[PDB]
Amino acid sequence: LPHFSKDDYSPESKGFVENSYLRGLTPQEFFFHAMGGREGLIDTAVKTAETGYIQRRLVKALEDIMVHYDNTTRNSLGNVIQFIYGEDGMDAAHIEKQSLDTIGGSDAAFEKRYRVDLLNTDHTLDPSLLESGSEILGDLKLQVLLDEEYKQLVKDRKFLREVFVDGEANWPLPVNIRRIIQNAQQTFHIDHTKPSDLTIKDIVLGVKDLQENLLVLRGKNEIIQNAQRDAVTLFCCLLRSRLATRRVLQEYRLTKQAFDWVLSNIEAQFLRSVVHPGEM
Amino acid sequence: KDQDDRDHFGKKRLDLAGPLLAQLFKTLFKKLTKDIFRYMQRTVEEAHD
Amino acid sequence: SLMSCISVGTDPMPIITFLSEWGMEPLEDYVPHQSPDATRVFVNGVWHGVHRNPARLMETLRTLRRKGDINPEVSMIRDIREKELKIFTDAGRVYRPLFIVEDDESLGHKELKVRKGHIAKLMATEYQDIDVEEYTWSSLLNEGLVEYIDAEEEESILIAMQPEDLEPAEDVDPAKRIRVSHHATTFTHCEIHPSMILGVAASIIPFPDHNQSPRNTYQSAMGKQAMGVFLTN
Amino acid sequence: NASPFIKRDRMRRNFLRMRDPNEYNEFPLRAIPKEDLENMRTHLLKFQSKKKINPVTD
Amino acid sequence: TTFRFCRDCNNMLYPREDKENNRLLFECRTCSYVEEAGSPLVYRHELITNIGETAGVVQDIGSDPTLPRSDRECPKCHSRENVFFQSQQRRKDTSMVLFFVCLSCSHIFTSDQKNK
Amino acid sequence: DQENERNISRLWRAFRTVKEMVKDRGYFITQEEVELPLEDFKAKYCDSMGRPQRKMMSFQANPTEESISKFPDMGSLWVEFCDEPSVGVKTMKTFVIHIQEKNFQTGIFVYQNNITPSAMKLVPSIPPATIETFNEAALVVNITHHELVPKHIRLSSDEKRELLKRYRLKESQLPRIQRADPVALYLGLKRGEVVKIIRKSETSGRYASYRICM
Amino acid sequence: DGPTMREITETIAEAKKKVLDVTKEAQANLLTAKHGMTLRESFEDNVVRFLNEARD
Amino acid sequence: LLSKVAALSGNEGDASPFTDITVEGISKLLREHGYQSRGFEVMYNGHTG
Amino acid sequence: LEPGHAADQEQAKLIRSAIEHTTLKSVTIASEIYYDPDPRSTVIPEDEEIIQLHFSLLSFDQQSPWLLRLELDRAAMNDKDLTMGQVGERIKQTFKNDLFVIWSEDNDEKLIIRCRVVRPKSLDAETEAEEDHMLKKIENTMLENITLRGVENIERVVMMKYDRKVPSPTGEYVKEPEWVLETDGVNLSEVMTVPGIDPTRIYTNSFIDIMEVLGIEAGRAALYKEVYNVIASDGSYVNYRHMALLVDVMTTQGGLTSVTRHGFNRSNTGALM
Ligand SMILES: [Zn+2]
Ligand SMILES: [Zn+2]
């Protein structure tokens, strides 16, 4: 401004408003503040025009893409864009952020929460968690089932870390398993002290059979079956992590009636979250 | 020396009604003068009063 | 702006003849190597000659403009660093008035040429209409108390925002805003008032310096959309 | 700490109420008679060169 | 580098070599005028140049009202009045060093403390 | 002699990359030779003075048993590394004659700087055998190992037929992959050949996509 | 309140002094430009950051 | 706040941008008129009183 | 950087300099053309010793008398780790055997390089007039089209420290710092081959280079990353499927088709559409 001296680099010279709106702005500050505002007004006007054209272009490019009854995403020509919408086949309106409990944590914490042993006494299951804890100790048939469960959990951890290199555990997924467990506990009024009537065989088989009912594609051929398995690989990892033998018996203390209720909701919730054919 | 700034208000000029009308009158008067002579050429050649 | 005015332009020839009589050497006999200190004289963008003592020419030219011999709208700029003297007389230039600051060694420091005695007669003529000798804005301009300055001439002057604190040589109320004195003892002009930077619409906003800049712009547009009394007829 | 009013309607009344020795050799200068300046034009000749051009000898 | 100009026509001379004496000659291209060179340098291209740091310093630099004032000491006349300015080169690689011009002796000094 | 070492290191890496290309295409290549140490490479593919001999680097690869079952039409593969930088018509002419002489179904040519147009235009000259030219500089780094590049698996004729039948598609309704694509060149895809791209999806973990060469 | 305003005033004053400190060394040419930046751009970055923090 | 004082005092407020007028100065005048310095007032709900 | 030297700072400087493009124009103050009648004695006081050094330690009969001199900045050659040996030999290989060059040692007060163009056996009488002009022409080229080291189209490189979460030996995720080089200008094919970098992690802002170097699928992943960054730059979050569908459409034809009238509008989808 024609009020300072040439080659002045002080904060006041180059537009530092030392005052507040309550105290008011000096004439030099007022002009500099006005200059900054004019930048915003010009940006707002130009940006509105630029964004409007961009929005129109995007819509016209993707206006003919729709999800068909075979779960494939195709344009007007029928050319395949995605063999399954969103690579999972779910609707964005039914997606919630959930934490994968297997990817995170240390190895020691992983063993303490998931590994269950009936032969040794290092990771033994407390007999008071279930009514059959007395006769469950020393049973090899149940031990192999637990071993099969644990190795699957270990595989999920290896796969999840290979997918998410940064190790982040919170990712969007269709069904909120945590809310379902909370509803089951309160609806049936879990005692939280008396041992549940659940059996290790029931829990392992119950979760395993539930994964089969999570159907996104209903083709009866190898190719569609392979796609169906891949479309629910990430969801099954969340399902197995939450519904673990120790977690169900120890963390959730679910009863047999509650456990059956939880499984039915997950199946119903998952089927409702599938993308509706005909969606634009 | 830095390139001259085109936003400098000192290098700008504001044309008001005066200069705006002056150019319009200058253009129109030129047409009137041209028309006057065209009449003279037509009057001289065609033998008209 | 409220005090902004636009020049109408005058004949530059009288200024050119004046320069020739006061030592403006014609460009036909200019040898750069025999005088590598002369100042180039420009009138309306035309290089008319060089002059050996640019200080005296500028002082004489400024004095004539202030007293009234040269039209006040004529703009004069002396680029000391570039050794150029530019005189502008064409129309379309935007200029605004400002106070003139001179040494006045009576008090030992630079001060406005306008004094309380002048302001006394300015108001006397203002209120006598509602009969002392007429004393209008023209009288101030002819007495060398105010000066028209345009953007081109703004480049070579130093302006003090207010005379209250910037002109005097140099507890505080916490409520008052922080003001920068700039501690400069070479001011050549002084703003009539900072509030005159605003226009007609922005002058109706109360406390526009306590508002965010975008809000002031919006109000200027809405004021023109307000019902009132455009005319009494 | 100040006066937040534009005091008017009585300040107008308020203002209205108070109101050399011979160490030289000078020769005479006279104009050329016009009898010889008619039908004759006297011009200035300027050689543009860095040498000393003299048509009398060069 | 210094440019040389011809004496007979004012045209600028160009370098030439004389193998008879192995010397440098500056010969005109139009009128055949020659002159032995006083220096062997004929070309220079300063990629990094400091010419123009104090460009614009005149006998009345102190009369400019927009220039700032300072109280630094003049190390040639012991005076406190002076006008300072930054480098006048507009290349966006110069330092912010200040050049001080005394109003009593027209001496120019700098605030540089790294190289001076 | 720093430049000599740099060239050897670049050549060693290029040779290492070429081995992966042959192995991934479905040819019997052992992991031991794939991970050949640098010192071992110099002991086998150099001479007394140090500079390597490109002629000795040329090798022959045969389809593995698994590849034959999936594709019972793949023949022998010959990989040749040119010695002189500028590949001329003479070198190309003998190279193409070399492949046709011994019934090599596919022939990979590795050059240093460039192949001249008259040599390049001779590339499609021995059907049904296929001739592929690779630049040594481009082979120094294996692009397939990049984290952004997913896994590409070529589909057999039977697999492609089932893919279209189950999805009830046409060859024009599948996603397209350019022949000049660096990955397509790596796998040596032909017109109408579909590749299964198995990439990792943040929404479903694993997602399988198909692209048809164009 | 008054005590807060006094603290706010000194916070800006201290920042202004810090901006002055960097300015003097830059004028002395002793300031070394940050890697990948010029002398003036580096000086501007230091001043801008200091003033932004003062407001915060 | 300024208008409240002006109406109470029967004056015209000075709302020019750059002046010595401050909120604290206006607040002092407002308190001298028997009102809360910052302009707050105790009001009653019209529905219930 | 390489996984075995990610945390090391010394290796960062070596690779950073190995990829940054530097030209003789950036390490020279002035270029001067001198006239030394004989290639055995000098006229400048400074170079009176350099000639006595190289000549004594050691053809020169056919060396042009016109001399080409460079003054170089030591501060320019220590910001980037360079020695006159590297600079000198680079000029030697620029012109294989057609000029002799002498460069002063680092210990010298001022860095200087002397260059002379050696004339052939045949004598040309017309080249004397342009002999100095020829020196200027080669002088300009030696300033512009000379690559001391690095990769073309790489204006500058700056190093930074990012934090990446990698699994700990115990099994938990622990963040540790690593040295990363950020560059202005893109040469993906050449930079990827430079030794010392991790080729499997190099990323490029321009997905066009990714597409033509890695593949369409790599370009698809890069294209999604760029779109995600822009939307996430302002803090707004959009579901993954929306971004993926747009990216898939832009890469469903085997290439990067734009969203303008020259891209999706050039397909075969009906004139009315
Ligand atoms: Zn001449
Ligand atoms: Zn002095």
Side-chain angles (χ1 to χ4, degrees):
Chain A
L1 284 168
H3 302 88
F4 311 105
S5 296
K6 284 175 158 56
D7 295 309
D8 190 4
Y9 279 97
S10 66
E12 295 84 30
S13 171
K14 290 203 80 76
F16 181 74
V17 182
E18 178 169 20
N19 294 294
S20 53
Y21 291 122
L22 172 72
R23 297 221 291 208
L25 269 46
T26 68
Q28 292 105 330
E29 294 172 353
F30 179 90
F31 201 81
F32 298 145
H33 183 45
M35 268 163 65
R38 182 73 70 83
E39 174 56 280
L41 298 170
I42 295 163
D43 288 330
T44 297
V46 302
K47 182 172 73 69
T48 293
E50 294 299 320
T51 55
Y53 182 45
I54 280 166
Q55 201 262 337
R56 181 191 142 68
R57 280 197 296 134
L58 273 161
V59 172
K60 271 284 173 205
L62 319 185
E63 64 171 22
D64 49 49
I65 295 159
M66 172 175 109
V67 172
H68 285 81
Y69 279 107
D70 58 350
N71 289 317
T72 52
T73 299
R74 305 175 183 216
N75 60 4
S76 65
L77 280 185
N79 296 355
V80 166
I81 314 304
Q82 288 166 320
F83 282 90
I84 200 181
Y85 176 49
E87 294 155 12
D88 60 334
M90 320 297 167
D91 214 327
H94 289 88
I95 313 300
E96 312 197 36
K97 188 171 222 213
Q98 300 171 76
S99 84
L100 302 158
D101 287 318
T102 46
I103 187 169
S106 84
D107 292 330
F110 187 68
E111 301 194 70
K112 188 68 181 294
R113 172 142 82 168
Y114 290 109
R115 181 64 179 171
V116 180
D117 200 320
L118 305 177
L119 274 294
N120 306 268
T121 184
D122 56 328
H123 303 287
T124 187
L125 190 66
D126 186 299
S128 67
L129 306 183
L130 72 166
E131 62 87 20
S132 74
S134 80
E135 60 265 22
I136 206 74
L137 192 68
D139 197 329
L140 277 72
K141 271 75 73 176
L142 279 297
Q143 183 55 56
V144 294
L145 274 160
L146 293 183
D147 290 331
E148 183 149 80
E149 190 186 5
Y150 182 78
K151 61 180 69 172
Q152 180 58 262
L153 266 293
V154 168
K155 273 187 306 210
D156 292 346
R157 180 193 256 270
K158 175 134 170 72
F159 168 77
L160 286 170
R161 284 171 160 219
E162 193 181 359
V163 171
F164 312 113
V165 301
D166 60 355
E168 184 177 1
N170 267 279
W171 290 99
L173 276 160
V175 185
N176 199 280
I177 305 182
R178 214 163 50 73
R179 263 219 304 287
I180 289 156
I181 301 293
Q182 282 284 338
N183 286 29
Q185 292 181 92
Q186 296 287 110
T187 300
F188 298 98
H189 312 293
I190 295 298
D191 305 67
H192 208 282
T193 80
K194 185 180 70 59
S196 46
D197 59 356
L198 261 179
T199 48
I200 294 173
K201 206 193 292 308
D202 188 0
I203 296 166
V204 178
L205 289 160
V207 62
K208 263 213 200 173
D209 63 47
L210 167 61
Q211 298 166 20
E212 297 301 320
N213 291 339
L214 312 178
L215 291 171
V216 185
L217 301 85
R218 292 168 199 284
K220 292 189 286 185
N221 53 88
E222 281 257 1
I223 286 176
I224 297 303
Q225 279 302 105
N226 288 318
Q228 159 61 22
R229 285 191 279 263
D230 294 332
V232 298
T233 299
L234 185 80
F235 184 73
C236 281
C237 279
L238 180 87
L239 193 66
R240 284 188 290 265
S241 67
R242 284 282 199 289
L243 301 182
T245 311
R246 180 174 289 176
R247 289 191 76 175
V248 170
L249 293 171
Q250 207 191 289
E251 289 185 15
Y252 307 147
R253 285 187 99 68
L254 290 184
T255 317
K256 166 68 176 186
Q257 185 180 2
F259 192 66
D260 195 325
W261 196 73
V262 164
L263 298 179
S264 295
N265 289 320
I266 286 158
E267 205 207 330
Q269 297 267 325
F270 185 94
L271 287 165
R272 274 204 294 274
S273 295
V274 185
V275 72
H276 281 254
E279 188 94 7
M280 303 294 322
Chain B
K1 320 284 289 304
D2 274 321
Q3 69 188 271
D4 302 77
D5 192 359
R6 294 163 94 169
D7 312 308
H8 206 286
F9 210 70
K11 317 290 173 47
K12 301 279 205 152
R13 302 284 177 277
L14 289 176
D15 286 355
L16 309 164
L20 287 172
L21 293 175
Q23 293 178 336
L24 213 64
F25 204 79
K26 182 69 140 53
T27 297
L28 297 164
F29 198 68
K30 281 181 188 177
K31 175 163 199 330
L32 186 64
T33 50
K34 195 164 211 92
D35 277 295
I36 290 161
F37 187 89
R38 183 175 182 169
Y39 198 75
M40 295 175 72
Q41 184 177 2
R42 184 178 177 83
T43 311
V44 164
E45 292 190 278
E46 307 191 358
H48 286 318
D49 307 318
Chain C
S1 283
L2 283 181
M3 294 207 89
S4 293
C5 294
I6 311 181
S7 82
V8 297
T10 61
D11 196 41
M13 181 66 181
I15 307 287
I16 303 179
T17 296
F18 207 85
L19 292 167
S20 296
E21 297 177 313
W22 279 98
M24 191 213 66
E25 301 152 4
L27 202 58
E28 273 70 358
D29 67 358
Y30 171 52
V31 194
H33 303 305
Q34 304 179 359
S35 299
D37 55 1
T39 292
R40 306 191 284 276
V41 181
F42 284 72
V43 177
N44 284 342
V46 175
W47 188 4
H48 277 98
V50 305
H51 187 273
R52 300 286 176 87
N53 189 358
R56 183 165 71 233
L57 177 58
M58 191 73 264
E59 201 275 347
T60 297
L61 285 179
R62 253 194 266 272
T63 309
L64 296 148
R65 181 153 67 98
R66 289 180 181 173
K67 63 182 70 178
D69 306 331
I70 299 179
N71 191 243
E73 301 183 334
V74 182
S75 176
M76 294 179 183
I77 299 104
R78 192 209 167 183
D79 209 309
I80 298 166
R81 289 175 145 176
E82 302 298 324
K83 295 184 286 186
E84 291 178 353
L85 180 66
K86 295 183 182 293
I87 301 159
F88 291 102
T89 300
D90 65 351
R93 300 177 287 97
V94 191
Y95 61 82
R96 69 197 184 100
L98 294 171
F99 284 135
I100 290 173
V101 176
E102 291 303 343
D103 210 356
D104 189 54
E105 65 273 16
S106 161
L107 274 80
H109 54 71
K110 293 183 184 293
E111 198 169 335
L112 316 190
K113 280 187 65 54
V114 68
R115 312 287 181 160
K116 294 198 143 285
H118 298 128
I119 303 305
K121 54 176 71 64
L122 272 296
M123 287 189 282
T125 48
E126 176 179 1
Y127 292 122
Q128 65 89 3
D129 286 353
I130 306 300
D131 186 287
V132 289
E133 179 46 60
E134 181 173 80
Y135 203 76
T136 59
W137 169 264
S138 65
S139 72
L140 293 172
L141 185 61
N142 271 27
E143 279 287 90
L145 309 182
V146 287
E147 191 174 4
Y148 289 142
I149 297 284
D150 56 24
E152 268 280 86
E153 198 169 350
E154 283 282 83
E155 294 293 328
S156 64
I157 65 176
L158 201 76
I159 314 173
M161 195 69 66
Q162 293 177 356
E164 299 278 303
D165 192 22
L166 281 80
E167 287 300 332
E170 193 185 308
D171 216 335
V172 72
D173 197 48
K176 282 201 77 173
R177 68 196 76 187
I178 305 297
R179 204 142 78 179
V180 65
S181 44
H182 181 241
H183 281 345
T185 64
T186 310
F187 290 121
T188 68
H189 295 89
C190 185
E191 296 288 329
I192 307 300
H193 201 258
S195 83
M196 288 294 124
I197 63 178
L198 307 171
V200 174
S203 313
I204 297 144
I205 303 171
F207 299 105
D209 57 339
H210 299 73
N211 265 354
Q212 207 196 352
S213 63
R215 319 309 314 177
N216 294 313
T217 296
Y218 298 147
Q219 166 43 44
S220 300
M222 295 188 286
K224 300 187 257 294
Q225 297 163 351
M227 317 194 164
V229 187
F230 64 97
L231 295 167
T232 49
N233 63 335
Chain D
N1 299 114
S3 180
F5 309 119
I6 50 170
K7 301 300 292 187
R8 293 182 181 280
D9 296 345
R10 292 191 68 80
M11 184 172 281
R12 173 172 299 184
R13 279 295 317 128
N14 191 313
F15 189 80
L16 285 164
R17 170 260 299 155
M18 64 84 73
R19 260 189 60 197
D20 307 357
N22 277 6
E23 61 185 314
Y24 61 84
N25 287 283
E26 63 184 343
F27 321 110
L29 168 58
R30 68 171 63 201
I32 193 71
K34 65 178 181 179
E35 292 177 350
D36 55 31
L37 208 74
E38 65 183 1
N39 300 131
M40 205 180 81
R41 295 179 184 171
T42 313
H43 304 301
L44 278 297
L45 195 144
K46 290 172 66 173
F47 296 103
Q48 189 64 62
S49 177
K50 275 201 171 182
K51 315 158 200 193
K52 179 154 187 104
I53 310 305
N54 189 359
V56 177
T57 59
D58 300 0
Chain E
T1 295
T2 299
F3 274 40
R4 285 188 178 81
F5 290 107
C6 186
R7 184 267 312 253
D8 289 341
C9 64
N10 197 16
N11 288 319
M12 63 195 286
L13 306 176
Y14 289 66
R16 185 178 177 84
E17 184 175 2
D18 182 65
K19 278 75 70 176
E20 296 300 320
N21 302 115
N22 272 358
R23 60 175 174 165
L24 176 62
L25 264 291
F26 272 102
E27 184 157 11
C28 186
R29 288 176 79 208
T30 67
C31 71
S32 77
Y33 164 85
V34 300
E35 181 185 58
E36 57 266 17
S39 177
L41 183 62
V42 301
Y43 181 70
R44 188 165 164 83
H45 178 64
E46 291 179 350
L47 287 90
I48 297 94
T49 186
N50 286 67
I51 300 293
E53 279 186 348
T54 70
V57 166
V58 295
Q59 59 263 40
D60 52 295
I61 188 154
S63 60
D64 194 318
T66 50
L67 282 169
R69 303 292 220 254
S70 165
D71 60 357
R72 192 152 300 202
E73 183 178 2
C74 182
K76 164 166 284 186
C77 78
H78 288 299
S79 295
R80 303 255 298 162
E81 65 276 9
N82 49 16
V83 292
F84 69 92
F85 48 80
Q86 268 187 3
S87 181
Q88 305 303 288
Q89 314 171 227
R90 303 329 301 257
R91 69 180 64 248
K92 56 154 287 183
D93 288 324
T94 62
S95 66
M96 315 185 52
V97 66
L98 304 167
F99 294 78
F100 293 71
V101 179
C102 189
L103 276 73
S104 295
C105 59
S106 197
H107 173 54
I108 303 99
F109 53 104
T110 185
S111 83
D112 199 348
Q113 285 160 217
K114 180 64 141 43
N115 197 329
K116 316 192 162 212
Chain F
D1 52 5
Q2 297 298 110
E3 69 285 337
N4 189 359
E5 268 284 338
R6 269 193 67 264
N7 290 318
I8 292 170
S9 182
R10 289 172 64 93
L11 183 64
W12 170 57
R13 296 169 71 191
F15 189 56
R16 187 256 192 287
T17 301
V18 169
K19 282 286 188 81
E20 302 174 293
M21 185 182 289
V22 174
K23 193 189 190 180
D24 290 331
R25 278 196 199 187
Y27 289 73
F28 182 71
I29 296 284
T30 64
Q31 190 75 38
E32 184 65 14
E33 59 184 335
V34 164
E35 309 206 9
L36 184 76
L38 173 54
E39 62 276 350
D40 286 332
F41 177 85
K42 293 179 179 179
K44 192 183 285 185
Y45 301 98
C46 296
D47 50 5
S48 59
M49 68 180 289
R51 291 171 171 69
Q53 280 68 64
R54 310 290 165 88
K55 265 290 191 203
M56 298 165 50
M57 293 177 71
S58 174
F59 64 92
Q60 194 213 82
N62 296 122
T64 186
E65 294 297 327
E66 183 64 26
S67 165
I68 285 289
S69 177
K70 183 62 67 65
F71 313 94
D73 60 357
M74 184 185 314
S76 297
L77 172 75
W78 183 256
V79 182
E80 181 88 8
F81 289 77
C82 184
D83 197 6
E84 61 183 342
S86 304
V87 176
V89 299
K90 183 177 176 66
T91 59
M92 192 69 202
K93 185 37 161 289
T94 184
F95 176 65
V96 298
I97 290 159
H98 195 305
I99 302 175
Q100 179 51 87
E101 185 62 26
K102 281 182 278 296
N103 209 27
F104 281 130
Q105 194 215 357
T106 305
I108 295 171
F109 195 71
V110 188
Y111 58 99
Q112 287 194 104
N113 285 104
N114 58 4
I115 296 168
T116 59
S118 179
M120 200 57 190
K121 66 98 183 174
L122 193 62
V123 164
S125 66
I126 300 164
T130 61
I131 305 301
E132 294 178 353
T133 61
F134 273 102
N135 189 34
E136 187 206 290
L139 291 165
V140 181
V141 184
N142 198 334
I143 55 157
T144 57
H145 289 351
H146 207 290
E147 60 183 7
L148 284 182
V149 179
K151 184 59 176 316
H152 298 56
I153 297 167
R154 190 168 61 115
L155 278 74
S156 63
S157 54
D158 268 11
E159 278 174 339
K160 169 175 185 283
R161 181 177 181 170
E162 191 178 1
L163 170 67
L164 298 172
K165 184 190 153 36
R166 298 322 190 171
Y167 284 108
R168 285 204 207 72
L169 291 170
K170 292 189 286 184
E171 304 188 0
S172 50
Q173 300 194 308
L174 279 170
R176 306 176 156 101
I177 185 169
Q178 278 166 357
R179 180 171 297 103
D181 192 46
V183 189
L185 281 182
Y186 179 95
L187 291 179
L189 302 180
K190 320 278 173 56
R191 183 175 181 169
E193 291 205 301
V194 182
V195 290
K196 195 187 183 184
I197 300 99
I198 298 166
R199 72 200 194 202
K200 298 177 185 283
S201 64
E202 53 174 54
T203 63
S204 52
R206 182 182 316 97
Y207 172 68
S209 185
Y210 303 89
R211 275 170 188 283
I212 195 164
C213 190
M214 295 295 289
Chain G
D1 55 357
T4 303
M5 293 298 290
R6 294 180 184 174
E7 292 167 350
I8 288 165
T9 299
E10 80 177 0
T11 292
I12 305 301
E14 290 176 350
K16 285 185 297 184
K17 185 175 76 67
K18 266 202 262 195
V19 168
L20 182 64
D21 293 338
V22 62
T23 300
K24 300 300 291 188
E25 59 172 80
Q27 283 164 6
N29 201 4
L30 294 171
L31 171 60
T32 186
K34 311 189 238 201
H35 193 271
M37 282 205 270
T38 62
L39 277 300
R40 298 185 168 276
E41 294 190 321
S42 294
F43 161 81
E44 292 281 28
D45 187 3
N46 292 333
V47 174
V48 169
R49 290 178 63 191
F50 282 31
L51 292 166
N52 292 116
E53 183 147 327
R55 178 187 62 195
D56 301 343
Chain H
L1 195 77
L2 182 81
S3 295
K4 196 172 178 160
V5 176
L8 286 167
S9 61
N11 285 307
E12 291 180 353
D14 189 25
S16 50
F18 317 101
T19 52
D20 293 331
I21 306 306
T22 69
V23 167
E24 288 272 328
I26 302 167
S27 292
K28 280 181 74 65
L29 284 169
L30 188 56
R31 183 67 216 265
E32 184 176 1
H33 279 285
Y35 284 86
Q36 195 273 333
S37 70
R38 308 305 187 195
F40 290 106
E41 304 193 10
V42 168
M43 296 183 76
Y44 295 68
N45 196 270
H47 297 169
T48 52
Chain I
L1 287 191
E2 186 181 2
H5 298 257
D8 178 27
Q9 188 161 9
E10 293 177 350
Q11 186 142 320
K13 289 172 65 175
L14 296 171
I15 290 147
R16 170 259 184 187
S17 51
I19 63 172
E20 185 177 2
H21 191 257
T22 184
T23 72
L24 194 65
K25 201 185 183 83
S26 85
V27 295
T28 182
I29 301 93
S31 65
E32 280 174 346
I33 304 300
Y34 277 103
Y35 176 81
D36 288 345
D38 74 323
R40 310 291 169 83
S41 47
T42 67
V43 183
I44 316 306
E46 278 56 49
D47 68 345
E48 181 177 1
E49 65 92 22
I50 193 168
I51 187 160
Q52 160 268 337
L53 180 139
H54 204 278
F55 183 76
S56 57
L57 290 160
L58 180 64
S59 55
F60 300 163
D61 59 356
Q62 292 178 334
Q63 279 167 329
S64 180
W66 293 87
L67 179 80
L68 191 153
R69 194 151 160 288
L70 281 74
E71 183 166 1
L72 304 95
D73 178 76
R74 56 167 72 259
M77 288 182 180
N78 59 30
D79 288 357
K80 307 175 286 298
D81 288 0
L82 280 80
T83 188
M84 294 301 292
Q86 293 176 335
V87 163
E89 69 186 2
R90 174 80 277 180
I91 298 166
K92 296 184 75 67
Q93 288 182 333
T94 298
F95 308 90
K96 56 183 179 179
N97 57 36
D98 288 341
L99 59 91
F100 185 42
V101 57
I102 306 148
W103 60 93
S104 69
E105 284 77 3
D106 53 12
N107 55 7
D108 191 359
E109 292 177 350
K110 294 181 182 297
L111 277 296
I112 58 172
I113 310 166
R114 306 257 309 268
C115 316
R116 286 187 197 270
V117 57
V118 71
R119 273 199 294 276
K121 310 318 172 200
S122 86
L123 273 59
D124 275 326
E126 297 176 350
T127 192
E128 271 289 7
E130 60 204 40
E131 175 57 288
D132 62 70
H133 195 57
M134 269 283 103
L135 267 183
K136 187 176 180 180
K137 273 188 174 174
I138 67 181
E139 181 269 343
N140 186 3
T141 67
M142 180 173 74
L143 288 175
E144 274 292 333
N145 77 345
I146 307 306
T147 300
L148 276 70
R149 57 163 189 221
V151 175
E152 186 62 26
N153 299 115
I154 294 306
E155 296 146 89
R156 66 182 178 87
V157 175
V158 57
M159 55 179 49
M160 288 274 109
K161 294 218 307 212
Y162 294 172
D163 289 345
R164 65 176 299 191
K165 292 180 178 179
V166 296
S168 171
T170 72
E172 199 159 350
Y173 267 96
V174 296
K175 61 176 77 65
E176 61 194 89
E178 58 163 3
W179 277 104
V180 64
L181 309 176
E182 287 198 329
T183 301
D184 283 340
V186 163
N187 208 334
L188 180 55
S189 84
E190 295 322 299
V191 166
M192 196 203 290
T193 296
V194 176
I197 65 170
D198 192 21
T200 59
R201 290 248 300 291
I202 191 159
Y203 185 62
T204 303
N205 207 12
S206 73
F207 55 89
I208 289 290
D209 293 287
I210 287 279
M211 210 270 285
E212 72 195 9
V213 176
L214 296 171
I216 189 67
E217 280 296 285
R220 184 218 170 274
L223 181 54
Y224 165 83
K225 201 162 160 185
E226 284 300 288
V227 172
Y228 175 88
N229 282 343
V230 174
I231 297 298
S233 72
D234 187 72
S236 187
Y237 160 81
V238 176
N239 195 287
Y240 165 83
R241 64 205 64 237
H242 305 308
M243 296 184 176
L245 189 47
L246 163 65
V247 170
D248 292 18
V249 167
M250 281 191 60
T251 57
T252 192
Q253 296 285 105
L256 297 162
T257 189
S258 76
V259 192
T260 78
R261 63 178 164 289
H262 296 92
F264 80 98
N265 204 10
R266 293 291 199 264
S267 178
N268 289 337
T269 54
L272 290 172
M273 179 185 288

